[PDB]
Structure formats: C-alpha cells, structure tokens
Design a protein around this nucleic acid. Structure first.
Lengths: 59, 59
RNA sequence: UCAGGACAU
RNA sequence: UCAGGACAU
C-alpha cells in the first residue's frame, strides 16, 4: 500500500509502462487519466469485479 | 489512454494485481492511494526519473 | 460526470 | 503540498 498527495496538472507512475495524470477537479469529483499498453487492463472498481470473477475476456 | 471522473472515496483498478483509491482533496491537492505487489514500482512523476535512468528497483 | 482504452482538455 | 510501499484516515 502507498499514499501520497498531488495537485491538478501533475502526474504519478506505476511499473515501467504505466502513468497516471490528475487532469483536474470538479467539486468532489476528480478527473484523472491513465496511460498503459493494451497488454494490461484498467477499469473502475465496479467493472473490475465482473472480470476477477475468473477471466480477462468475455464470452 | 483512459480518462475517468470519480470523487473522494471511490476506487479504480489496473492489471490483475493493482488498485487505486482517492483518499480525498484539499483545494487543488488530491491525496491518492495505490495498492500493488513489491514485484512492481510506484512513485510520483518526480521520483520516477531517478528510476528510468537505467533500472526499476532500488538497492 | 455513471463508464471508457478518449485529456475534451 | 515536505516523500513513502503507511489511508493517518
């Protein structure tokens, strides 16, 4: 686990092929971006539960 | 490239072993959390430049 | 901004 | 906002 603080217009990184960018905020909402190869997956925590059910590609 | 707009307390996911959470905001600041194995790296964009200089894991 | 592989900025 | 593998929340 890691925790750190950032502000709009800055970035964070993961692995050696992933990047994250805080595009800005709108009230409690926070617009964020993600940059990774299609060799990996990325979704909301909601959609992730449909995938970790036992797969990475639908029927 | 992906873009999301979610608020404090929400979560997002990457790969099959990474998770992200938005702990909250303060004006323009945005405190964030990350959860991944030590088999991968995670730092802010500032520290990432010390790593991509020729490596991906500290001493 | 209700969910996408797009900064719509 | 100071930099860590910790929500210090």
């Amino acid at each position: 686990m890691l925790i750190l603080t950032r502000k709009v217009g800055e970035s964070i990184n993961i692995g050696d092929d992933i990047t994250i960018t805080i595009l800005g905020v709108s009230g409690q909402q926070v617009r964020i971006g993600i940059n990774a190869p299609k060799d990996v997956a990325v979704h909301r925590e909601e959609i992730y539960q449909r995938i970790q059910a036992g797969l990475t590609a639908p029927d």
